[PDB]
Amino acid sequence: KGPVPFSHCLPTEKLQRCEKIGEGVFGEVFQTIADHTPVAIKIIAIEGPDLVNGSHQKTFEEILPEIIISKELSLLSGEVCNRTEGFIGLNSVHCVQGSYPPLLLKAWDHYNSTKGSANDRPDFFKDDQLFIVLEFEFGGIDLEQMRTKLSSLATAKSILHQLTASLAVAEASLRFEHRDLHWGNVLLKKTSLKKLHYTLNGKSSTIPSCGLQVSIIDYTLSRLERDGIVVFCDVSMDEDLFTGDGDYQFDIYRLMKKENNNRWGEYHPYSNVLWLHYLTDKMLKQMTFKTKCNTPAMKQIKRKIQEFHRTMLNFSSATDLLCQHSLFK
Ligand SMILES: O=C(O)c1ccc2cc1OCCOCCNc1ccn3ncc-2c3n1
Numbered sequence: 001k002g003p004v005p006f007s008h009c010l011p012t013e014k015l016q017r018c019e020k021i022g023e024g025v026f027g028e029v030f031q032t033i034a035d036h037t038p039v040a041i042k043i044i045a046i047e048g049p050d051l052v053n054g055s056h057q058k059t060f061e062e063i064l065p066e067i068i069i070s071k072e073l074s075l076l077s078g079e080v081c082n083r084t085e086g087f088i089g090l091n092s093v094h095c096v097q098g099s100y101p102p103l104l105l106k107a108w109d110h111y112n113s114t115k116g117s118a119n120d121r122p123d124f125f126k127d128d129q130l131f132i133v134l135e136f137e138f139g140g141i142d143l144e145q146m147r148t149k150l151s152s153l154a155t156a157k158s159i160l161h162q163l164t165a166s167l168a169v170a171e172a173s174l175r176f177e178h179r180d181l182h183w184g185n186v187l188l189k190k191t192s193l194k195k196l197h198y199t200l201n202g203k204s205s206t207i208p209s210c211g212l213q214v215s216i217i218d219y220t221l222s223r224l225e226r227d228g229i230v231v232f233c234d235v236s237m238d239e240d241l242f243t244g245d246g247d248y249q250f251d252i253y254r255l256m257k258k259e260n261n262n263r264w265g266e267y268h269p270y271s272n273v274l275w276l277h278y279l280t281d282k283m284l285k286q287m288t289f290k291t292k293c294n295t296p297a298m299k300q301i302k303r304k305i306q307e308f309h310r311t312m313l314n315f316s317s318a319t320d321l322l323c324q325h326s327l328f329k
């Protein structure tokens with residue numbers, strides 16, 4: 001009907017349980033508890049003239065694409081022909097109006113004192129400020145933060161398999177490209193399921209979990225389509241995105257532009273292969289595992305992931321990798 005007050009999405013008990021879990025130029029992310037269940041709350045200032053975290057705020061029209069994409073991908077958990085739970089669940093979206101809640105400022109301050117923030121303290125917003133508030137499934141901790149915490153390369157294999165299957169299902173259903181799948185955008189949480197289920201073009205299969213559920217996040221650069229209407233971020237005139245250095249991540253932006261001839265509206269699912277390659281490279285070169293490959297069977301998984309790294313760039317999509325690559329047989 002119109003924007004709601006913060007206390008609509010965050011009644012006092014929910015607000016009092018908020019702890020800050022992450023941040024970016026976009027704003028802030030909190031974990032809280034609703035009906036005994038953790039959820040993640042992402043809060044983005046929109047439509048105002050103030051710089052926030054050094055950048056202008058998005059308009060409603062600029063933020064809408066990523067909300068639409070979020071929802072489409074979340075909806076794949078309930079589909080039939082192309083079904084996956086490997087994208088973050090989206091529970092609700094609200095437009096809220098007001099100054100920033102003092103209880104969230106307390107949470108922001110605690111994070112700043114313990115971990116340090118790159119952001120502005122969000123205490124300067126007036127009572128007319130608009131925000132989008134997204135409530136997500138709680139996805140756990142990002143892969144970059146788990147650099148030293150995973151059990152073994154068996155776990156790495158599960159994570160790669162989960163990511164490849166989820167991307168394949170989204171290619172098949174939505175002609176999806178993530179386009180920014182760095183290791184801060186892969187979330188890991190514990191699961192008691194021994195195996196995870198997906199369906200790709202009507203064929204169902206399973207993935208051993210190694211006790212982890214992967215969730216893909218962050219759709220600001222993503223592209224998909226339904227009945228020929230394409231939702232995508234046109235970065236064709238962006239300069240900075242293609243001039244980064246110091247990590248293979250920044251090559252991937254350039255490699256995508258090469259692949260698509262700088263036409264971001266087109267469908268090039270090879271971009272998903274490029275991100276999976278980047279992720280595999282991180283698994284082999286930056287991750288460090290609690291148990292190394294000390295037995296024949298583990299040394300074989302290491303060799304298969306090494307083979308994946310050397311061969312996967314000859315595949316045309318995540319779908320091609322899932323269906324044809326020997327790693328997943
Ligand atoms: O943009 C989205 O699609 C997005 C969706 C879900 C979450 C965050 C998102 O963006 C902000 C990313 O930066 C925070 C990093 N860490 C964590 C940790 C745990 N969760 N659980 C959900 C999210 C989350 N983020």
Ligand code: NA
Nearest residue numbers: 085087088089
């Ligand atoms: Na999910």
